[PDB]
Amino acid sequence: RLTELREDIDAILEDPALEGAVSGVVVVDTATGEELYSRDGGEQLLPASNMKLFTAAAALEVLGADHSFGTEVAAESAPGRRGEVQDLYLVGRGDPTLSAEDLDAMAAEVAASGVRTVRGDLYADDTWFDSERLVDDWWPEDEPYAYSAQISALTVAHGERFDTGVTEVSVTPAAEGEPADVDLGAAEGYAELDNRAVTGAAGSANTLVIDRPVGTNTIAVTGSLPADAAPVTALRTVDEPAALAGHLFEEALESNGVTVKGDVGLGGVPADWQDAEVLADHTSAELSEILVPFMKFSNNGHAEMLVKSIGQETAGAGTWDAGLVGVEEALSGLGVDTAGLVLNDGSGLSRGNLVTADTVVDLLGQAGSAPWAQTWSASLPVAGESDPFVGGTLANRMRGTAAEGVVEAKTGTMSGVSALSGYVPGPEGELAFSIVNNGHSGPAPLAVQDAIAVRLAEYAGHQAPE
Ligand SMILES: *[B-](O)(O)[C@@H](C)NC(=O)c1ccccc1Cc1ccccc1
Ligand SMILES: [Co+2]
Ligand SMILES: [Co+2]
């Protein structure tokens, strides 16, 4: 095809959805190196979550595909005869998957290694990273939601998708007139609850709202929920994620016969502790396994944690500023030319980011030529696949088309921003593309993205199913 394929994409790209918008669309054969389509490939645009590609590759570079994260528990000395200690520390070192059950097993160890009592205070130590909890230009009004999760070294991850810094809020109706039962889940007895919610008559106005008023650690429920309606689970953030982890760990300890007589709160392992006793430790799966629930579902926590991890590796500075310089650096070292990159964050959430479709495709190029390449591939959503962990953010797109089970792309979405970028493998060769829609006045031009994606899939020796 080539110029015929060009014509096909030229046709797609006029669509009345893309009215008033800029679009970096770039296609390259991995093998031939040749450029197969270009348009505004050098234009600066916000990537939203496509930023994640840059973060993922950097992290792979700087930490290696087999890097593992640690949590541990420490006291100044071994427990004393009746099984006692003074202060006690739960210490995060950036594990983006540390779970309530992981906490449990660590508690069980503290018991197993002799401790009957924490006769002083328990600290949640998250100082491996700085404590700047949110990016300069993140929007305040987003904060209660999961994707705006606070960023902290010590952070508990909820459910199999390892969403950090949240709690699940359960809202279950009673009967018409009667109020509704609200659970804060993991955050119970950590965050405040202000339940003004009320079950309404069956099949009526659903007007429920689960909020955390800016600057507070209070879950505000308000509005109505119909009696016949199904129970609403809902993911919501909390302030100081390490304090929550502290609280959960108190719960864990007491639940393993370890009494905690003092306060729970934030604290760093003191410098005057030269022979600290590591009573318990946990180790996350290596970075390879972590990239999946990260990239599949586009997890902001993980991204921004890895930036601060890149920060700690290259500079010993668990900080966006260093993490970010260590991102630019990593990439330059990968062959990627970063002239057009503007880094504000690692997830894409920052409006302050900028990219170009060549900078993307460049990166895609350099990535498939890598010791890690394979694990990089394993992270990206694969179109039209039911199983959330295969489909990721593309599970419900390009179904029953050439691209289904073929195209390896990464999504990026925001009020005025869309993006699709990855690999089109197949019989007639591998292929690499970037489509970065920006400023479109309506809904995210997903039809265009998908229509182009299928085009390439056919171009690779695939057929639409029947
Ligand atoms: B990325 O997936 O573009 C990511 C940075 N976007 C968000 O986290 C985001 C921004 C604004 C509103 C909602 C969300 C969540 C989201 C949006 C699309 C796909 C996945 C998650
Ligand atoms: Co509790
Ligand atoms: Co096929």
Swiss-Prot record:
This is D-alanyl-D-alanine carboxypeptidase. It comes from Actinomadura sp. (strain R39). Inhibited by benzylpenicillin, cephaloridine, ampicillin and cetiofur. One of its GO terms (molecular function) is serine-type D-Ala-D-Ala carboxypeptidase activity. Its main location: secreted. Belongs to the peptidase S13 family. Substrate binds at residue 410. It catalyses: Preferential cleavage: (Ac)2-L-Lys-D-Ala-|-D-Ala. Also transpeptidation of peptidyl-alanyl moieties that are N-acyl substituents of D-alanine. It comes from the Bacteria. One of its GO terms (cellular component) is extracellular region. Residues 97-270 are annotated as: Absent in class-A beta-lactamases. Pfam families: Peptidase_S13. The keyword Hydrolase applies. Pathway: Cell wall biogenesis; peptidoglycan biosynthesis. Keywords: Antibiotic resistance, Carboxypeptidase, Cell shape, Cell wall biogenesis/degradation, Hydrolase, Peptidoglycan synthesis, Protease, Secreted, Signal. GO terms for biological process: cell wall organization; peptidoglycan biosynthetic process; proteolysis; regulation of cell shape; response to antibiotic. It is found in: Secreted. The gene is dac. It is an enzyme of class 3 (hydrolase).
